[PDB]
Structure formats: C-alpha cells, structure tokens
DNA sequence: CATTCGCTCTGCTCCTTCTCCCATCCTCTCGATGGCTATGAGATCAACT
C-alpha cells in the first residue's frame, strides 16, 4: 500500500482513512504499544529510606 | 576459711529466613492446548459340545 493513490486504495478494497501502522497475524489486526524504559548510558543517583547504603549512583 | 577462679547455664539483642496477604461483581475477544505403523507371540475365558 506505500505510496498508492486513494483510487488504487479503493480499487484494492483498502480504506484511504485507514493510518496503517499495524500488523497482520493471522488474519489479527495487531498494534504494538510503546514500552517506557529508564535511559541507557545516563549516570542517575537515588537513595532509600531504608537499605543499608547511603547512595547509589548508577549507569 | 575467705576468697578466687573457672566453669555451666540462662536470657537478652540482631541478624537470616520464611511465610502470609493484597475490594466486589459483571462483559467481551484472542491464543494455545490438542499425543506412530504394524506384524508377532501369547494368556484369558466366553462360549460350543
């Protein structure tokens, strides 16, 4: 469907409307949910109420 | 004979370990699970006489 025109949509029984943006499995329309991470390569420093260190500073 | 010394016996902390629990009811969709072929010997007793 890249690049087509509305009239090749309509003609492949496609809906110009539609984002795309999904997958098909099995006949299953399938989107993938984006999953927050932490950052990589960032030093962060926390600290705990109640651990047996002080701070932690970690990559 | 008045210590004194050494030895046994509590019992008071501070871990480690481990076990338990985390609102009620109701609806829907979706994925997955989903298990030889065949020829022989040979024991049983259902069942004929």
């Given at each position: 469907?890249?690049?087509?025109?509305d009239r090749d949509l309509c003609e492949l029984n496609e809906c110009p409307?539609?984002?795309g943006g999904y997958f098909i499995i099995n006949g299953?329309?399938?989107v993938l949910i984006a999953?927050?991470?932490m950052a990589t390569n960032t030093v962060?420093?926390?600290?705990k109420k109640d651990s047996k260190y002080?701070?932690?500073g970690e990559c």
């Open positions: 469907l890249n690049g087509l025109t409307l539609d984002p299953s329309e399938k999953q927050e991470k962060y420093v926390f600290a002080a701070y932690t």
